Amino acid sequence: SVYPKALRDEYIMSKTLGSGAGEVKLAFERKTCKKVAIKIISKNVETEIEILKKLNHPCIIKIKNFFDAEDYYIVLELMEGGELFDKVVGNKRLKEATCKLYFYQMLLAVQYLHENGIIHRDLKPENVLLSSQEEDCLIKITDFGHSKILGETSLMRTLCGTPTYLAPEVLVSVGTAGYNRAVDCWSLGVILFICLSGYPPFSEHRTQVSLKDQITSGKYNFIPEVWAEVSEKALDLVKKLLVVDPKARFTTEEALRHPWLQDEDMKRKFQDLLSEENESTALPQ
Amino acid sequence: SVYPKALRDEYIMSKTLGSGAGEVKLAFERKTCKKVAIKIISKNVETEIEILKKLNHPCIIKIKNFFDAEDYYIVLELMEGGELFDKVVGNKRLKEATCKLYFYQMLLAVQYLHENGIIHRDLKPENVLLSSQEEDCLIKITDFGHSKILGETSLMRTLCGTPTYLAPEVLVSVGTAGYNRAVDCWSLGVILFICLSGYPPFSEHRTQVSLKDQITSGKYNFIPEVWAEVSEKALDLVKKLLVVDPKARFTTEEALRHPWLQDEDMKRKFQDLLSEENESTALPQ
Ligand SMILES: C/C(=N\NC(=N)N)c1ccc(NC(=O)c2cc3cccc([N+](=O)[O-])c3[nH]2)cc1
Ligand SMILES: C/C(=N\NC(=N)N)c1ccc(NC(=O)c2cc3cccc([N+](=O)[O-])c3[nH]2)cc1
């Protein structure tokens, strides 16, 4: 095949940066001669695009352009650090400090999603991009292919009338409705676990308990020797996110107020990284 | 206000037949001089229309025309018998035979919906229309405003991968997923109860138990004197439909195989009514 003409008109395509199940290419925008990343999706991408066009957060990827052709082409800012996945694969592990910097940003991103009525639903190291190859860098969450937009539910509409003809299971669902965002907090819990320890909390490696039973019981694989070097505060947060009951699970707000994230140096590094990214116009006064 | 010009072009509007929360008018189609009903909905109606345009069953209302103007206008076949509601209101009750004829048709309709991946979600006497003012008549289910189209779920897509990062509540939901159609079977249960007895199974009339607790416990209001005259087979079916566990609840197939509906005279009256409705072209042989 060839790249679509409208893409070629605006961009020169270059080397592969990565591969999804999917592919990411380096490209140069002709107008500016600056590097961009182009995600190719083989044929609800257009509504993922609409979601991402309306979100404005430094820790969420921004769409620069979009082409709907033989395949989809999504142009975004280059994230030269690549995926978080590559930093944690093969039992590699990040310093606890670097974990905290990254995780803080993930929480800010996800908090902003949930405030804006969006649930991501596929948070994982593959979908966290690093702005640079330096350890202290900005991260951005990507891939909104599984995301969902919260709004008025069928349930809410049902509850407006009298339940003369309404099934008991609908009434029972009221106790737990409206906590779908908590699935993101679980995933974040799993991400943090992996970042701090270099291994997954739930996996079929050297165990006879099924992955499903591990997850539904909440019984993560704790190896103390790996964790000895990790703070108690870090592990405490992990434990409040990997809570099986979604109504009891920490929200992003609760996580951000956790002792582990009350870290003024970390928050300085983040603010410094932000201003560094920014290329501001002159301002009055 | 005035009726839209495109409606006026094709139809002469006449008297009110009824009122929703909503209104139904008598109209005459100019081309044929024949009577039609026009439902007015003050401003997902257009997709309700698309659902009803693709369904083809004698016990489901057919759309003849549609106008999307200041309000929505939906043209359909006249159902001169009106709503089932009016036959059961004020503790009026139908002969058990008439209940069976009507209910059989409701089951056929709902069975056809569920076969076609549609759940109605608002089955009630108000949404059952009678073709004539005779007791032995055809019925049609109407009002697909709350309906939902079944198809590949997010759940199914989630289960295709590995649940490394997946929340326990999603895995727990697998046990009960795919039974949303059972809400229609519950409602049918409530409709049948009302038809046979002339009173609602669950209501706040002369009780201290909340409507919600009545429904979730499945503890319907049984008044034996009202029921003495009703068969045991009729009440048995009622009980298999008003089953609180949606996985145990009778499906439309199970209901149709129930002893109460193994009634050859009833099924003859229905077939006779069908052929009577029909105005067939000549056929080879
Ligand atoms: C929106 C989206 N996917 N949406 C979807 N699959 N439905 C999406 C998914 C992944 C990305 N990934 C990248 O931009 C991305 C991956 C990568 C790896 C090494 C190096 C770079 N880089 O930019 O230098 C990379 N960028 C970008 C967008
Ligand atoms: C599709 C629909 N509603 N959809 C919605 N509200 N979202 C809908 C709702 C109700 C009806 N009702 C009738 O056609 C209808 C009600 C009625 C009462 C006395 C007499 C007649 N009649 O036709 O002689 C009646 N027809 C027809 C359509």
Ligand SMILES: [Mg+2]
């Ligand atoms: Mg994905």
Ligand SMILES: [Mg+2]
């Ligand atoms: Mg309705």
